Amino acid sequence: LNGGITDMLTELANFEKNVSQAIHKYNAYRKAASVIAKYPHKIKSGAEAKKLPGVGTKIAEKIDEFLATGKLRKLEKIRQDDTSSSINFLTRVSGIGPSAARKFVDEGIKTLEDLRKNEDKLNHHQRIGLKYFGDFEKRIPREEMLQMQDIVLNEVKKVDSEYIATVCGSFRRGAESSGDMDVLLTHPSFTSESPKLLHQVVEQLQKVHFITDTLSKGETKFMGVCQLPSDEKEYPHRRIDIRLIPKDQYYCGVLYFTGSDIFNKNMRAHALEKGFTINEYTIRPLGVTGVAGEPLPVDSEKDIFDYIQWKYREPKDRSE
DNA sequence: GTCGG
DNA sequence: GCTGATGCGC
DNA sequence: CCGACCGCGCATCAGC
Ligand code: NA
Ligand code: NA
Ligand code: NA
């Protein structure tokens, strides 16, 4: 209903992140765009929007200007500035953030073609981002997410049957498509109390030509690129993350990385109401002075809901 | 840019 | 070479 | 009025 407005706000967000290097303004604009996107009426004025949380005085003014004129002069200015628009474009390459993009543009590197000419000036991450520029911007239909899941769960199984693997994100909530694949991994041998555990899994996924490129990889986190097996149309390359988490912190991690972010907000709020604090890693009781005690045992997501006396919420009912 | 202490 | 800072994506 | 707004793992750099 307010597609024009939320587009305007997103454009402003991208400009603050990429050109102004103002990450909190970026997120303020995103917050505004989200809350307006969800508003079940066609906004008729700035004052109306300002009733919404995340929408303040300045955004209300831009909404008035947009509604009267169908544009923002601030945005037209920005779009007609070659430097700003080139900086903004270059950050669409994974690995090229606001700093690299400004540096590149400063020396006349402004397009994909320019990057290709200057690949010697890119780091490994950036080269991969450039290589799969188009594929990385594609969404992943749920039916492919399911084929990808089966591959990952099976190959993990082949390395060792005690591995536990869970594909999280909006996917786990029943999303009809995903931006990437986020995999949480654990193993009985890994706990916060006390060895190539992730490597063995990455190596096997490479072995079967599922994982095709690595952006980064250490003992607990892998970020890379994967592709489904193809005499017909070859699949786009996709971003996959794999995180190795201690088993005693595993289901808190699943909970967190399943979201939604709004769901996590309401659940941490409710946990506090009842004398617990939940973060990505643990659920801890609060003493009366507000001192967090030791992390509680967690053997499943359900355990966390139990502790705070909340009725178990199916992942697909976790929109908020 | 918006919010809350 | 070593340590701590920064950039980056999440 | 003023600081918070998540903060972490990894790659790379800055400074030594
Ligand atoms: Na508001
Ligand atoms: Na980028
Ligand atoms: Na605050």
Residues 34-63 of A with CB under 7 A from strand B: 52-60
- Contact A305/A314 with Cβ under 8 angstroms? no
Exposure letters A148-183 (e unless 16+ CB within 10 A, then b)? bbebbeebbeebeeebbbbbbbbbbbeeeebbbbbb
- Which CATH number does the domain A257-319 belong to among 3.10.290.10, 3.90.800.10, 3.40.50.300, 3.30.210.10? 3.30.210.10
Method of elucidation: X-ray
A254's enclosing H/E stretch is helix A250-258
Residues 85-144 of A with CB under 7 A from strand D: 123-125
Residue with tokens 């995999």: A183
CA A31 – C1' D1 distance (Å)?
Answer: 23
- Where along chain A do the CATH 3.30.460.10 domains lie? 139-256
Give the helix, strand, coil percentages of chain A, each rounded to 5. Answer: 50, 15, 35
Task: Tokens for A168, please give them.
Answer: 């999280």
Residue A241 to residue A47: CA distance in whole angstroms: 42
Q: Which nucleotides of C are covered by protein (CB under 7 A)?
A: 6-10
- Cα distances (angstroms) measured from residue A180 to each of A135, A142, A167, A199: 11, 11, 10, 21
Amino acid at A156: V
CA A220 – C1' C7 distance (Å)?
Answer: 20
In three state form, how does the secondary structure of A143-210 look? HHHHHHHHHHHHHHHHHCCCCEEEECCHHHHCCCEECCEEEEEECCCCCCCCCCHHHHHHHHHHHCCC
Q: Which among A103, A99, A208, A108 is positioned nearest to A150, based on CA atoms?
A: A208
- Where along chain A do the CATH 1.10.150.20 domains lie? 82-138
Look at residue A256 and give its three-state secondary structure: helix
Look at residue A8 and give its three-state secondary structure: helix
Look at residue A104 and give its three-state secondary structure: helix
Q: Which among A177, A184, A195 is positioned nearest to A257, based on CA atoms?
A: A184
- Where along chain A do the CATH 1.10.150.110 domains lie? 1-81
Look at residue A80 and give its three-state secondary structure: coil
A317 secondary structure, DSSP code: G
Ligand nearest to the CA of A98: 2
Virtual torsion, Cα A143, A146, A152, A155, nearest 10 deg: -100
A124 CA: nearest nucleotide by C1': D11
Look at residue A238 and give its three-state secondary structure: strand
- State the catalytic residue, choosing from A62, A71, A138, A311: A62
Cα-to-centroid distance, A315 and ligand 1 (Å): 30
Q: In this structure, what are the phi and psi dihedrals at residue A20, rounded to the nearest 5 degrees?
A: -80, -20
A169 CA: nearest nucleotide by C1': C10
Q: Which nucleotides of D are covered by protein (CB under 7 A)?
A: 4-6, 9-13
Dihedral sign computed on CA atoms, order A148, A152, A157, A162? negative
Q: Given phi > 0 = left and psi -120 to 50 = alpha, else beta, which region is A54?
A: left
A193 contact partners, CB below 8 Å, separation of at least 6? A248
- Contact A74/A62 with Cβ under 8 angstroms? yes
Task: Write the CATH number of the domain with boundaries A139-256.
Answer: 3.30.460.10
Ligand nearest to the CA of A137: 2
- Contact A204/A212 with Cβ under 8 angstroms? no
Catalytic residue at A62?
yes
Residues 8-27 of A with CB under 7 A from strand D: 24, 27
A227 contact partners, CB below 8 Å, separation of at least 6? A209, A210, A212, A234, A235, A236, A237, A238
Q: Which CATH superfamily is domain A1-81 in?
A: DNA polymerase beta, N-terminal domain-like (1.10.150.110)
- Contact A314/A290 with Cβ under 8 angstroms? no
Q: In this structure, what are the phi and psi dihedrals at residue A261, rounded to the nearest 5 degrees?
A: -60, -35
- Where along chain A do the CATH 3.30.210.10 domains lie? 257-319
Look at residue A308 and give its three-state secondary structure: coil
Based on the number of CB atoms within 10 Å of its own CB, is A135 exposed (0-12), middle (13-18) or buried (19 or more)? middle
CA A29 – C1' B2 distance (Å)?
Answer: 9
Residue A121 to residue A299: CA distance in whole angstroms: 48
Based on the number of CB atoms within 10 Å of its own CB, is A286 exposed (0-12), middle (13-18) or buried (19 or more)? middle
Look at residue A75 and give its three-state secondary structure: helix
Virtual torsion, Cα A144, A209, A200, A245, nearest 10 deg: -30
- Which CATH number does the domain A82-138 belong to among 3.40.50.10320, 3.30.470.20, 3.90.950.20, 1.10.150.20? 1.10.150.20
Transcribe A24-66 into DSSP letters.
HHHHHHHHHHHHHHT-SS----HHHHHTSTT--HHHHHHHHHH
Does the annotation flag A302 for ligand binding?
no
CA A288 – C1' C8 distance (Å)?
Answer: 40
- Cα distances (angstroms) measured from residue A202 to each of A37, A195, A237: 39, 13, 16
Residue with tokens 């709020």: A269
